[PDB]
Design a protein around this ligand. Structure first.
Ligand SMILES: *[C@@H]1O[C@H](CO)[C@@H](O[C@@H]2O[C@H](CO)[C@@H](O[C@@H]3O[C@H](CO)[C@@H](O)[C@H](O[C@H]4O[C@H](CO)[C@@H](O)[C@H](O[C@H]5O[C@H](CO)[C@@H](O)[C@H](O)[C@@H]5O)[C@@H]4O)[C@@H]3O)[C@H](O)[C@H]2NC(C)=O)[C@H](O)[C@H]1NC(C)=O
Ligand SMILES: *[C@@H]1O[C@H](CO)[C@@H](O[C@@H]2O[C@H](CO)[C@@H](O[C@@H]3O[C@H](CO)[C@@H](O)[C@H](O[C@H]4O[C@H](CO)[C@@H](O)[C@H](O[C@H]5O[C@H](CO)[C@@H](O)[C@H](O)[C@@H]5O)[C@@H]4O)[C@@H]3O)[C@H](O)[C@H]2NC(C)=O)[C@H](O)[C@H]1NC(C)=O
Ligand SMILES: *[C@@H]1O[C@H](CO)[C@@H](O[C@@H]2O[C@H](CO)[C@@H](O[C@@H]3O[C@H](CO)[C@@H](O)[C@H](O[C@H]4O[C@H](CO)[C@@H](O)[C@H](O[C@H]5O[C@H](CO)[C@@H](O)[C@H](O)[C@@H]5O)[C@@H]4O)[C@@H]3O)[C@H](O)[C@H]2NC(C)=O)[C@H](O)[C@H]1NC(C)=O
Ligand SMILES: *[C@@H]1O[C@H](CO)[C@@H](O[C@@H]2O[C@H](CO)[C@@H](OC3O[C@H](CO[C@H]4O[C@H](CO)[C@@H](O)[C@H](O)[C@@H]4O)[C@@H](O)[C@H](O)[C@@H]3O)[C@H](O)[C@H]2NC(C)=O)[C@H](O)[C@H]1NC(C)=O
Ligand SMILES: *[C@@H]1O[C@H](CO)[C@@H](O[C@@H]2O[C@H](CO)[C@@H](OC3O[C@H](CO[C@H]4O[C@H](CO)[C@@H](O)[C@H](O)[C@@H]4O)[C@@H](O)[C@H](O)[C@@H]3O)[C@H](O)[C@H]2NC(C)=O)[C@H](O)[C@H]1NC(C)=O
Ligand SMILES: *[C@@H]1O[C@H](CO)[C@@H](O[C@@H]2O[C@H](CO)[C@@H](OC3O[C@H](CO[C@H]4O[C@H](CO)[C@@H](O)[C@H](O)[C@@H]4O)[C@@H](O)[C@H](O)[C@@H]3O)[C@H](O)[C@H]2NC(C)=O)[C@H](O)[C@H]1NC(C)=O
Ligand SMILES: *[C@@H]1O[C@H](CO)[C@@H](O[C@@H]2O[C@H](CO)[C@@H](O)[C@H](O)[C@H]2NC(C)=O)[C@H](O)[C@H]1NC(C)=O
Ligand SMILES: *[C@@H]1O[C@H](CO)[C@@H](O[C@@H]2O[C@H](CO)[C@@H](O)[C@H](O)[C@H]2NC(C)=O)[C@H](O)[C@H]1NC(C)=O
Ligand SMILES: *[C@@H]1O[C@H](CO)[C@@H](O[C@@H]2O[C@H](CO)[C@@H](O)[C@H](O)[C@H]2NC(C)=O)[C@H](O)[C@H]1NC(C)=O
Ligand SMILES: *[C@@H]1O[C@H](CO)[C@@H](O[C@@H]2O[C@H](CO)[C@@H](O)[C@H](O)[C@H]2NC(C)=O)[C@H](O)[C@H]1NC(C)=O
Ligand SMILES: *[C@@H]1O[C@H](CO)[C@@H](O[C@@H]2O[C@H](CO)[C@@H](O)[C@H](O)[C@H]2NC(C)=O)[C@H](O)[C@H]1NC(C)=O
Ligand SMILES: *[C@@H]1O[C@H](CO)[C@@H](O[C@@H]2O[C@H](CO)[C@@H](O)[C@H](O)[C@H]2NC(C)=O)[C@H](O)[C@H]1NC(C)=O
Ligand SMILES: *[C@@H]1O[C@H](CO)[C@@H](O)[C@H](O)[C@H]1NC(C)=O
Ligand SMILES: *[C@@H]1O[C@H](CO)[C@@H](O)[C@H](O)[C@H]1NC(C)=O
Ligand SMILES: *[C@@H]1O[C@H](CO)[C@@H](O)[C@H](O)[C@H]1NC(C)=O
Lengths: 175, 319, 319, 175, 319, 175
């Protein structure tokens, strides 16, 4: 996908996440855990539900039309009835093929984007108190219990609070 | 430890599925739905449209009143079903532009007939034939009136019938081509016939052509069928010298959602809103590959038998 | 303070507007434009195309030369407008394949006529009728020549007219179906008529059919109209026994941008490049919902009455 | 939008910016100010003006055609004229619906991208002398008068000049 | 130095090329390919389809058996090529609905004929004409049998030919319109002719029309051509009083990939799978602008003469 | 393009790279060099080869049809044959125009994305040991011989190894 998140820097998906489409796993002072992110899951799904409805109008009633199968040869008029039906079917077949390709591309790309968006949003909160490990994980330079991890998932994490602590742990170096 | 790792991720499923994008011919996503209806119900559902089974009768025969089609007088339909094994069993006929008349009537959605009191003085009405048996008895198309000599003449007929109604009337009538001059003069005095059906705005004259055609139900003569539409305020006029197969009344043209379809699949007790010759089909997908002939609320016919629309993200199992 | 904050942002407007994307049924953007023309001018603009108002006349009558259509001889048009309340007022007629002839002439964009010196020896020309009054006087279609007996015969007519021009000539002619044998023999000596119009490559023979049709402007007879196209180098030939309603000349077929349209809306003094039955419409949008019948430089007709195209970013007011 | 800038990390738009589509607000030693960015505004607009022209050719003249309204019933030939016109109208209706959806999606997405592009371009200049506050703002660790802010908007900002100063202010910490 | 710089980049080419996107009317990319075939080969390739050059003959003449078309009996084709300079050189004729018959035969892909032993008692067969010279000798359409009086009568003909085959038979036949009553009675005893061709399900009767038409190859008479399709189990019957131009047998209707095309470009020895009037065209692009008339495996005709599809990234040379 | 990489932060392309579509140039202790990145080059090309095949089915055989050129005027039936052919050609012309625009947009955008993806992937490896100079280059704070640069191109670069060294060189400052 254009963002290189899914099937990119995120090495793979998690079969063990039944809770949602996107989310977090973590290892902290209280062991390990997992939580789904509902906002971004819902942003994806809203885009994908009823996707086709935004292009095709609800199916229309059609009643008497032209005949399309003929039991005798007639020439000119039958030739034209045949060609009209053929022209129509080919055009729709093209339409449906293209629609699928377009829509799917859109779907692939928007879901990559939601993943990336959520990574970015997380990184931005953490600010200088953490490191992008390059595989979709963050190294956080402080004691971050479940409550603290909960604060990051809910968007309430105040980075100034932990800054001095993360500084000490980060910069235990030089040499 | 006094640090932490927070990992970001997305879901995956075990048994994923392949779709096409603008970028890839095939790529695995978590889920997808079929957009093409491939499968028919195998029967034609008796709801929600009014379906009428031709059984042994074509639409035209039902409307002309071929005796074995008597059960269809009075009937109307959303969709009339014609079967392969339908047969004619009255006097052998032909219709120039058969298809157009079949379409006009199909479209109208009824063969209900409204008799009118045409008066034909100096001729004998209700001509019958052994080709066209209603019971033991010789008979004829019920909506048509075969006219012949009374006594030893057949006078120029000159008959009107005005349309004082709100609607267009449809009149079905015909001419008899006999197989011999001896049969011509026997039935109609004159040696040459003629029929001229006119209105204020249109006319059609037909002259019959004596001679043998191949035998059909013991007849080498034939009947040719014509029609005339008569608008409100306008007037039907019939002028004939001999050989007229006359109308008994009119069909009412409704502007209809009605049609006709050729199929051999049985009709059965189920519910659906799209009908094809293969049977009713489901309605929930946007496209279908069952038949280009459809009636009702139908997905659009395309040449592909399958199209997969992703409804989930790229599925990436553990590497 | 000795630091600084630099904020990035985008604009917003107070009164934004909703559009549809592949992602959302409805989402607010700063601005958008209508892509569908919903509204007609209510009149038909007299510019920039040459519009001709049929008023009381159909295109066919104008071209045949029905007396109340005399003002239309000489005329040409980009678009001929036919009105509901048009009427015929000459001898009652019919044209097999009326529509095709209406289309051919409409397409050609003129009823200008070029008389030719056909010579018809042994018959009387310029037949008149009380059905067809030009002034107080009995008269007839001006582009047609009703031929009858001179003295006490009507000889086999055998007349040619070669086309030595660069172009196809269009010839309009007809046959008279009278209402009685007594009127037949009175007008044309023979008891049966015939007309055979031929070229090197084509021919059409018509035989008239005596008898009463409904009265129209005091006439129970009728005229049937035919046409014949004669190519360069080719030759018109007319052969008749009686009943011929003869041509006086030809119409020139131009290959035209010309047409005909049915409408009752008034013509008025404005400017536009697309015309419909509802009136002229504006041209700047790519689609329209006014009418499927259009002429000129027209947006494409679609079923939707509105479609909004974003011309600005997502509008996000203060939360 | 796929970049999560507009209606994302940028909490909202500014009704007070009449000057342009994208730009900057700032608070420095000389008070507060606002400026539009013309490059990125123009990049958006160029893409959106005459957008439809890149898909539909200028409207064509069409003259005599087929009739589309009928005063009498005729059957076969009229059935075909009707079906041809219907087939055509349906196909165009589909086209126009899809076109709108596509184009709009494109429009939404390209404008998000311009915003993001401008944020990124700004961040890149600043380098280690500033911090992404997470809401589309940058915290700059030095005295940055209007001239200095002007240098960042015009792409002339030399970060080496301010580096030692921003270091002192950044790293007033540990504890 | 003890640091390093690592730069990221992409390629560029010297001579790039312009394409259109949704965002730009024109933007330079590294490479692109034409999607529209603009250029024709200039000749019609003799492979891979079976091409047959009408040369001097129309498809209809080849099938009727105009003497200068004798080389075409026996032939079949995927595509029959008709030339502008083709001419008829037998008895002057006309076909109502010529085009439909041309289409039926073209579609069938052969003029191979299967003679049947019709027996015509009491008339003289093999009528010849100076309009239609096969050698020095007077002759006639080889697939047609001109029938006239034997001795001093021409009896009502009543002839059958049943179809006991698997397939529909196509029968070509005609009627002779003579130029004078004196020529009528001379050739056929009766003063009026008639021809009635029938099956169990259909019939067509034609009456000839005496009189002069313009001279063509010394003839002012004419022949009108008709056809009749006879289904399996069904029966051809012919009934005539005079003036019959009779069939000698049937053409077999195949359901074919076959067709006919009008072109003047020469046929030549090359290979291709799409043919137009301008010549064969290449097949590798998805669209073409050469001609809307095509046959074979063809790109789709569009109005644009060029369309460029990027096959590389945006090309950005050094600033 | 939506990512602002190509014709953006990457000032321009390199005519001297014949080796691939994307890659690296570098200046280190052993002088200067250049290498193509094959993964990302191949990701682009795979998307662009046979692109059109994913929308148009292989060209179909079509045999006898309707006539499209007429030598005589006839009216109704010829009018309809003409209008049918016109309707068809216009619809396809629209299709082909739109297809080009769509596909090209896709092509432009995916190639921008590959470039950006590769920059990002590189940055992520380097972590705190390097600086984004803003023009598509990275300043690396240590002796990085060809072997070391090779490790970054192949994805094997261990940043912990160089961290103390890059710290010393980075933070030779304050004042
Ligand atoms: C919905 O209903 C439609 C009909 O409206 C069905 O579409 C039609 O399907 C049928 C068959 O499934 C197709 O009919 C064939 O048409 C072709 C072309 O003309 C023809 O070759 C074929 O002949 C078949 O019957 C012959 C009669 O004896 C066989 O001899 C013949 O050859 C076979 O010979 C041996 C003998 O067993 C076989 O072993 C060989 O393999 C050989 O093939 C063959 O069986 C049929 O007449 C028809 O083309 C098709 N389409 C149309 C538009 O009519 C749909 O299938 C149906 N759709 C769904 C989803 O149910
Ligand atoms: C451009 O011009 C076109 C015409 O070319 C206009 O399109 C047409 O609009 C008209 C009406 O606006 C439509 O005509 C109707 O057709 C339907 C279907 O057959 C028919 O039901 C309807 O009947 C109307 O008139 C009757 C005559 O007495 C009424 O009795 C009838 O029922 C009403 O009864 C009472 C009496 O007042 C009412 O209160 C009830 O509400 C009830 O409805 C009804 O009024 C018309 O004959 C026509 O369908 C339509 N389309 C076409 C393709 O012809 C366009 O409107 C115009 N476009 C623009 C943008 O101006
Ligand atoms: C594939 O084959 C098709 C044919 O199936 C070709 O398409 C056709 O091309 C021709 C010409 O290239 C077009 O024919 C013209 O049709 C127009 C419209 O009716 C007509 O104006 C034009 O007249 C030409 O010939 C006249 C005869 O004397 C000239 O007088 C006339 O005017 C010219 O006068 C002087 C005299 O020299 C010139 O100097 C002036 O400039 C002036 O123009 C003119 O030359 C032709 O009859 C035809 O429209 C077109 N399309 C169709 C659908 O038929 C294709 O070109 C071909 N395609 C490819 C790729 O090879
Ligand atoms: C012009 O020539 C035609 C061609 O022969 C003549 O038509 C034929 O006329 C004869 C004389 O009557 C008919 O004969 C009989 O038909 C009756 C029924 O035929 C069938 O019935 C049996 C079962 O009972 C079936 O098994 C057969 O397959 C038949 O379909 C029969 O009952 C009666 O006794 C005679 O045998 C021919 O049937 C008829 N053929 C056709 C094709 O019309 C026509 O008479 C003649 N006209 C003239 C000379 O003026
Ligand atoms: C075959 O039968 C038809 C059916 O009746 C015969 O046609 C009728 O012929 C009669 C005899 O002449 C015509 O009579 C008259 O019509 C004249 C005008 O009629 C109207 O004018 C008044 C106003 O002046 C209107 O209010 C009416 O509504 C009428 O339209 C009238 O001036 C004259 O004095 C007679 O009263 C019939 O009109 C006519 N009807 C039709 C439908 O043609 C036809 O004669 C006959 N043929 C035969 C026996 O050979
Ligand atoms: C109804 O009137 C028409 C119109 O005139 C009569 O048709 C004409 O009949 C005459 C009398 O025979 C024909 O005369 C001749 O034609 C022969 C060949 O003509 C041409 O050949 C030369 C070269 O040899 C060319 O250069 C010319 O351009 C001609 O095409 C000729 O050999 C013979 O000696 C006569 O001169 C007319 O050709 C013919 N014209 C047409 C248009 O048919 C028709 O006879 C008459 N019917 C009646 C009175 O019942
Ligand atoms: C896999 O896909 C199908 C199709 O999207 C899902 O089932 C649909 O759910 C929608 C609404 O969410 C309902 O209208 C129907 O029940 C289904 N629609 C169709 C067209 O089949 C299903 O939820 C998905 N399965 C899993 C395991 O996630
Ligand atoms: C359709 O026609 C068939 C054939 O005429 C009818 O079946 C016949 O019915 C009679 C009396 O009911 C039997 O004696 C015949 O032997 C039957 N023939 C066959 C071939 O089955 C049948 O009744 C008609 N169908 C309907 C629905 O009316
Ligand atoms: C809102 O949208 C309309 C439509 O884009 C704008 O008006 C158009 O401006 C174009 C060129 O920029 C001109 O061709 C016309 O004056 C208008 N075109 C149409 C189709 O209406 C308008 O600028 C926008 N309004 C605001 C306040 O930004
Ligand atoms: C169209 O026809 C009407 C009806 O014949 C004409 O109006 C008549 O005009 C005469 C004399 O000018 C009046 O005495 C009649 O009473 C009018 N009748 C009606 C019903 O108004 C009208 O002149 C014609 N229109 C045009 C444009 O020629
Ligand atoms: C420029 O573009 C053309 C078209 O893409 C390239 O040539 C094509 O290469 C494909 C497969 O890669 C082959 O099928 C054909 O040889 C060519 N196809 C067509 C349609 O022309 C060519 O590689 C490119 N040129 C350069 C210098 O990169
Ligand atoms: C097509 O017709 C022309 C014209 O009849 C034929 O060419 C003639 O051939 C004869 C004898 O071979 C010559 O004496 C004539 O002078 C030729 N006339 C012309 C105008 O060239 C030609 O043979 C026919 N073409 C084919 C392929 O049969
Ligand atoms: C998936 O498919 C496997 C292999 O075909 C099968 O054994 C199993 O029933 C399915 N399991 C799941 C979890 O879908
Ligand atoms: C916008 O709409 C409001 C509420 O309908 C109305 O009072 C006002 O006139 C409009 N104001 C602006 C700034 O568009
Ligand atoms: C490119 O075009 C230039 C200028 O037209 C020409 O001299 C040269 O032959 C071409 N060179 C390359 C490298 O494509």
């Amino acid at each position: 996908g254009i963002f290189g998140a899914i099937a990119g820097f995120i090495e793979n998906g998690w079969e063990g996440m039944v809770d949602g489409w996107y989310g977090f796993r973590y290892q902290n002072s209280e062991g390990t855990g997992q939580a789904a992110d509902l906002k971004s899951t819902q942003a994806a799904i809203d885009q994908i539900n009823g996707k086709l409805n935004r292009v095709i109008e609800r199916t229309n009633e059609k009643f008497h039309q032209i005949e399309k199968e003929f039991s005798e040869v007639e020439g000119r008029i039958q030739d034209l009835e045949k060609y009209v039906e053929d022209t129509k079917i080919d055009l729709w077949s093209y339409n449906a093929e293209l629609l699928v390709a377009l829509e799917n591309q859109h779907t692939i790309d928007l879901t990559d984007a939601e993943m990336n968006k959520l990574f970015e949003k997380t990184r931005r909160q953490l600010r200088e108190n953490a490191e992008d490990m390059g595989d979709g994980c963050f190294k956080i330079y402080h004691k971050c219990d479940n409550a603290c991890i909960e604060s990051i998932r809910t968007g309430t994490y105040d980075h100034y609070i932990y800054r001095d602590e993360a500084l000490n742990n980060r910069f235990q170096s030089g040499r | 430890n006094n640090t932490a790792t927070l990992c970001l991720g997305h879901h995956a499923v075990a048994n994923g599925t392949l779709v096409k994008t603008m970028s890839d011919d095939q790529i695995e996503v978590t889920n997808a739905t079929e957009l093409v209806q491939s499968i028919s119900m195998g029967k034609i559902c008796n709801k929600s449209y009014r379906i009428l089974d031709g059984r042994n009768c074509t639409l035209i025969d039902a409307m002309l009143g071929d005796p074995h089609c008597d059960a269809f007088q009075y009937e109307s339909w959303d969709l009339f079903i014609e079967r392969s094994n339908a047969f004619s069993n009255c006097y052998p006929y032909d219709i120039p532009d058969y298809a157009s008349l079949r379409s006009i009537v199909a479209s109208s959605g009824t063969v209900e007939f409204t008799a009118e009191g045409f008066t034909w003085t100096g001729v004998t009405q209700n001509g019958r034939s052994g080709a066209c048996k209603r019971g033991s008895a010789d008979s004829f198309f019920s909506r048509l009136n075969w006219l012949t000599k009374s006594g030893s003449s057949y006078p120029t007929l000159n008959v009107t019938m005005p349309n004082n109604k709100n609607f267009d009337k449809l009149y079905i009538w015909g001419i008899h081509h006999p197989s011999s001059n001896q049969e011509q003069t026997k039935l109609y005095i004159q040696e040459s016939g003629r029929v001229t059906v006119s209105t204020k705005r249109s006319q059609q004259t037909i002259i019959p052509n004596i001679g043998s055609r191949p035998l059909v139900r013991g007849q080498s003569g034939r009947i040719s069928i014509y029609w005339t539409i008569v608008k409100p305020g306008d007037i039907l006029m019939i002028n004939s010298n001999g050989n007229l197969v006359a109308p008994r009344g009119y069909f009412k043209l409704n502007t209809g959602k009605s049609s006709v379809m050729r199929s051999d699949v049985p009709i059965d007790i189920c519910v659906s809103e799209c009908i094809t010759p293969n049977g009713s089909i489901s309605n929930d997908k946007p496209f279908q590959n069952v038949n280009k002939v459809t009636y009702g609320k139908c997905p659009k016919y395309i040449r592909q038998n399958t199209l997969k629309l992703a409804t989930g993200m790229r599925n990436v199992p553990e590497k």
